[PDB]
Amino acid sequence: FFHHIFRGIVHVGKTIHRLVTG
């Protein structure tokens, strides 16, 4: 529950960083 919710936060950074970093 906690790890799942937190995990989603990291994923949001992966896509955003991927797009920004190309």
Short mmCIF file of N, CA and C in Angstrom, two decimals:
data_model
loop_
_atom_site.label_atom_id
_atom_site.label_comp_id
_atom_site.label_asym_id
_atom_site.label_seq_id
_atom_site.Cartn_x
_atom_site.Cartn_y
_atom_site.Cartn_z
N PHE A 1 0.86 -1.22 0.00
CA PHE A 1 0.00 0.00 0.00
C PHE A 1 0.88 1.25 0.00
N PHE A 2 1.77 1.34 0.98
CA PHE A 2 2.67 2.48 1.07
C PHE A 2 3.70 2.44 -0.05
N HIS A 3 4.30 1.26 -0.23
CA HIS A 3 5.31 1.08 -1.27
C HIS A 3 4.70 1.25 -2.66
N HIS A 4 3.46 0.81 -2.82
CA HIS A 4 2.78 0.92 -4.10
C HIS A 4 2.53 2.39 -4.45
N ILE A 5 2.03 3.14 -3.47
CA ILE A 5 1.75 4.56 -3.68
C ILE A 5 3.04 5.33 -3.96
N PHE A 6 4.08 5.03 -3.19
CA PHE A 6 5.38 5.69 -3.37
C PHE A 6 6.00 5.31 -4.71
N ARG A 7 5.85 4.05 -5.07
CA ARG A 7 6.40 3.54 -6.32
C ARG A 7 5.85 4.33 -7.51
N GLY A 8 4.56 4.64 -7.46
CA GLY A 8 3.91 5.40 -8.52
C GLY A 8 4.56 6.78 -8.69
N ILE A 9 5.01 7.35 -7.58
CA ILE A 9 5.65 8.66 -7.61
C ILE A 9 6.94 8.59 -8.43
N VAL A 10 7.73 7.56 -8.19
CA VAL A 10 8.99 7.38 -8.91
C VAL A 10 8.74 7.22 -10.41
N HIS A 11 7.72 6.43 -10.75
CA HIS A 11 7.38 6.20 -12.15
C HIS A 11 7.08 7.52 -12.85
N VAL A 12 6.37 8.41 -12.16
CA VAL A 12 6.03 9.70 -12.73
C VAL A 12 7.30 10.48 -13.07
N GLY A 13 8.35 10.25 -12.29
CA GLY A 13 9.62 10.93 -12.53
C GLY A 13 10.36 10.30 -13.72
N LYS A 14 10.18 9.00 -13.90
CA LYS A 14 10.86 8.29 -14.99
C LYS A 14 10.39 8.76 -16.37
N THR A 15 9.07 8.89 -16.54
CA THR A 15 8.52 9.33 -17.82
C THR A 15 8.85 10.80 -18.06
N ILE A 16 8.70 11.62 -17.02
CA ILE A 16 8.99 13.04 -17.15
C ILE A 16 10.47 13.26 -17.46
N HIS A 17 11.33 12.55 -16.74
CA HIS A 17 12.77 12.68 -16.95
C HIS A 17 13.16 12.15 -18.33
N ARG A 18 12.50 11.08 -18.75
CA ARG A 18 12.80 10.49 -20.05
C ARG A 18 12.48 11.47 -21.17
N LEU A 19 11.32 12.11 -21.08
CA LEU A 19 10.91 13.08 -22.09
C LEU A 19 11.82 14.29 -22.09
N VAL A 20 12.13 14.80 -20.90
CA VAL A 20 13.00 15.96 -20.77
C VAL A 20 14.42 15.63 -21.22
N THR A 21 14.94 14.51 -20.74
CA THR A 21 16.28 14.07 -21.11
C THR A 21 16.30 13.50 -22.52
N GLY A 22 15.13 13.46 -23.16
CA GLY A 22 15.04 12.93 -24.52
C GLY A 22 15.07 11.40 -24.50
#
